[PDB]
Design a protein around this ligand. Structure first.
Ligand SMILES: *[C@@H]1O[C@H](CO)[C@@H](O[C@@H]2O[C@H](CO)[C@@H](O[C@@H]3O[C@H](CO[C@H]4O[C@H](CO)[C@@H](O)[C@H](O[C@H]5O[C@H](CO)[C@@H](O)[C@H](O)[C@@H]5O[C@H]5O[C@H](CO)[C@@H](O)[C@H](O)[C@@H]5O)[C@@H]4O)[C@@H](O)[C@H](O[C@H]4O[C@H](CO)[C@@H](O)[C@H](O)[C@@H]4O[C@H]4O[C@H](CO)[C@@H](O)[C@H](O)[C@@H]4O[C@H]4O[C@H](CO)[C@@H](O)[C@H](O)[C@@H]4O)[C@@H]3O)[C@H](O)[C@H]2NC(C)=O)[C@H](O)[C@H]1NC(C)=O
Ligand SMILES: *[C@@H]1O[C@H](CO)[C@@H](O[C@@H]2O[C@H](CO)[C@@H](O[C@@H]3O[C@H](CO[C@H]4O[C@H](CO[C@H]5O[C@H](CO)[C@@H](O)[C@H](O)[C@@H]5O[C@H]5O[C@H](CO)[C@@H](O)[C@H](O)[C@@H]5O)[C@@H](O)[C@H](O[C@H]5O[C@H](CO)[C@@H](O)[C@H](O)[C@@H]5O)[C@@H]4O)[C@@H](O)[C@H](O[C@H]4O[C@H](CO)[C@@H](O)[C@H](O)[C@@H]4O[C@H]4O[C@H](CO)[C@@H](O)[C@H](O)[C@@H]4O)[C@@H]3O)[C@H](O)[C@H]2NC(C)=O)[C@H](O)[C@H]1NC(C)=O
Lengths: 380, 378
């Protein structure tokens, strides 16, 4: 059940797909948390206008309670996100950098056929100081066409963010370092007769001397070489994320130099361990969620009591809760109606310095006229 | 005079430096704007608390004007940032991707010396069907030590964000494509006597037999080869960022396939055009900045006394603003700016003692709680 995604990595292209998919996963987690913060801050702006439009002291106090609750939880969550966000971005960055690296090495290791140039025949020249004949080539090249990664339906099912929850990941798979450092080639030389400096008929891209030079080794004395294949084998390597106990990161830095895969496993381990805590969605808050939130015990005592310093007893909390039900309604439907539905449904319109505003509450408070509408209504 | 940084790109490592430096420039432009938005919202939370602790209705009105002005300008700048942010991030990503690509190619193109394997002596075999001897090698390899980019202080001064304003950038410099696609090598075959399939003494990583084999074709018959040099030479290419008018981006996508360098040029040009406007810093606002901000005309008219503005009305609103916020900047600083860091706020409610300055408290895990306490006393 574990390691479905990493266990499917067998090739440069599938490691690339793993590396990019995991990077986007972490990036998506940061985005979802920040969109949730954005919605919470937009709700607090909406309730700030609604408080400014209340004439009821009790309703006014109810909106102020939601502003105070939302500010506390959203500011706290934004502050809490910063550590995990930076840990997850560090991993995502390295994974995309590794995938780029591999994609470039993939293009070069795909160059598997050589283009021979016209050699020059010689005698005893370095590095063959004991040869009687040498055939010397310069600027042999090997190039492949533009390489692309192509993926099977199985590839995309297994190497998928659905398989990248922290609880199923114990290892990563990487292509071995020689794929990124080493050129590998096969070559063969061939001799015939007595190749010498005179073996200077090159039409066959070799060094043919003096018989009837021509195709294959036509001349009585021929010498040549050919690079017959190039390309380094991509071998796969496994790296563990955790130590024996299953909790600590295995490749913590500071224990000497590390292979690329060891650096990556550490970053992935820490990014998996850095679970983001997404705050409550204010815009879809429910009455029972609100009254059960422990922050609303002290906030309710601040706004809804008449007269507590010390910590609340059981009877004191249940008092605060009934005050909370009075302020916010006794049923969710009332709560939704008077505090949630006004965000999208309540219409606000005004006109001040020659500037007509006609929006609904949440859209207006996230618009260029937002602060002008707050000043207008706090002014009446 | 223009293109100082791109004009210093002469090697793979200086293109890498240029690519990363420009990417960080775009990234730091976004971070500067988003850092301003963060400080603004934290100022607005600070003034929200200062308003709730205010007993004077007129001083309360003043804080609500700062709250309203800040929310208006910060919400607007946040929304305006999103387009340019995405355009600059598109460029920064691609530039970091190119730099990674070029770094990986450099590691491979630095492999300049081969290690031979032990060969196998043959007779005629493909691709040498006429040979009397062949000497066949499998898995010859070329590897460099770990490559780094070493930069001079002149590199870092010329390839620098200070040389990457939009007005000085007309081209980019890139290493030509063959550096990233093509292996280049030199090789030489050597023969002596009559090499045959019996030339199976391989101590020299060549094929020898007869006589006294050993170094430099010591045997009576010998054949072998050596790859004496590897590495493709990196050449530079220039790409223009703008079309003939000098304002619209060249190499726009949707005109057939493009070279890597042309895709990069378009992204850089659009990122250069997508200028980010950083909002006014609320936490360091001066009085003249506040009263002369055009948003404060309507915002003062709404809270300080509202027409639905002549020359006169604008004069009237200005002195209304000086009335609320101060006649001097030292007063405005003292009453509205300095208390964010200098005014300690304390209280006690939920069995929790809380003491902090205003701005720190309104960004702390007790921020909303402090707001409910003071709006509750009021
Ligand atoms: C760092 O270093 C790395 C490593 O070297 C670099 O990474 C490489 O970068 C290159 C260049 O970007 C990559 O190669 C390009 O890949 C493009 C993306 O393709 C994917 O996504 C697109 C969606 O945008 C999708 O269409 C593709 O799927 C197609 O192919 C699969 C596989 O068969 C198939 O399942 C799909 O059905 C699609 O097939 C259609 O299209 C194929 C051609 O693409 C046809 O062969 C097929 O019959 C079918 O029609 C894929 O999922 C891709 O768009 C690029 O292809 C372009 O450009 C090529 C030249 O570069 C050219 O040879 C191709 O023919 C194609 O050109 C055509 O399409 C483009 C885009 O629409 C048009 O602008 C052109 O005008 C042209 O259109 C004609 O042909 C059309 C289709 O035939 C036709 O409709 C139209 O009418 C026209 O006649 C490249 O393949 C490469 O993948 C990367 N490699 C690796 C290993 O990562 C990296 O760049 C570098 N980074 C930096 C910053 O330096
Ligand atoms: C994608 O592919 C990429 C391409 O393949 C790949 O990139 C490569 O990554 C590797 C791995 O990270 C890189 O190698 C590492 O490079 C580190 C940095 O090396 C350079 O800088 C060092 C520090 O010296 C500078 O800074 C000092 C302090 O500020 C100054 O006092 C110096 O004057 C000097 O300043 C100059 O350079 C600064 C940076 O450019 C610059 O800010 C400043 O202005 C000024 O210009 C240098 O020491 C180092 O030089 C070493 O190597 C060069 C080779 O050219 C020699 O000429 C020198 O003689 C010297 O030996 C570079 O200039 C290294 O720190 C790091 O080294 C450690 O690890 C390796 C093994 O991996 C060991 O061999 C080495 O000894 C080090 O190990 C030890 O020390 C550490 C302490 O840090 C210790 O913890 C550890 O236990 C151990 O004891 C390593 O070599 C490589 O550079 C990248 N290459 C390229 C082309 O980019 C990338 O990883 C891939 N990415 C993914 C995701 O896969």
């Amino acid at each position: 059940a574990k390691d479905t995604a990493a266990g499917h990595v067998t090739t440069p292209c599938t490691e690339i797909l793993f590396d990019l998919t995991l990077a986007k996963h972490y990036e998506n987690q940061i985005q979802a948390a920040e969109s949730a913060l954005n919605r919470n801050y937009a709700a607090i702006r909406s309730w700030t206008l609604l408080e400014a439009m209340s004439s009821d002291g009790n309703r006014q106090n109810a909106y102020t309670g939601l502003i105070a609750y939302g500010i506390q939880i959203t500011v706290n969550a934004e502050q809490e996100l910063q550590g995990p966000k930076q840990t997850k971005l560090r991993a995502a960055h390295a994974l995309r950098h590794r995938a780029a690296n591999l994609s470039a090495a993939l293009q070069i290791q795909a160059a598997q056929q050589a283009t021979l140039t016209k050699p020059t025949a010689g005698g005893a020249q370095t590095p063959f100081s004991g040869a009687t004949g040498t055939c010397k080539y310069e600027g042999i090249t090997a190039t492949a066409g533009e390489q692309s990664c192509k993926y099977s339906t199985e590839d995309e099912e297994k190497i998928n963010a659905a398989h990248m929850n922290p609880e199923v990941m114990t290892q990563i798979t990487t292509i071995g370092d020689k794929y990124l450092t080493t050129i590998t080639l096969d070559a063969i030389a061939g001799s015939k007769g007595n190749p010498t400096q005179s073996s200077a008929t090159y039409a066959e891209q070799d060094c043919q001397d003096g018989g009837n030079p021509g195709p294959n080794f036509g001349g009585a004395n021929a010498l040549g070489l050919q690079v017959t294949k190039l390309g380094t084998k991509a071998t796969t390597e496994k790296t563990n994320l955790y130590t024996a106990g299953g909790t600590e990161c295995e490749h913590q830095p500071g224990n000497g130099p590390q292979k690329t895969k060891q650096r990556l496993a550490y970053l992935v381990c820490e990014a998996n361990k850095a679970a983001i805590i997404t705050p409550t969605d204010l815009q879809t808050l429910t009455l029972d969620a609100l009254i059960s939130a422990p922050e609303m015990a002290a906030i309710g005592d601040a706004l809804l009591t008449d007269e507590t310093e010390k910590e609340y007893s059981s009877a004191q909390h249940t008092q605060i809760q009934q005050l909370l039900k009075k302020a916010y309604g006794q049923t969710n439907e009332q709560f939704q109606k008077n505090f949630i539905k006004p965000l999208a449904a309540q219409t606000v319109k005004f006109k001040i310095g020659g500037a007509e505003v006609s929006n609904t509450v949440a859209a207006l408070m996230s618009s260029p006229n937002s602060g002008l509408a707050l000043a207008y209504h706090k002014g009446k």
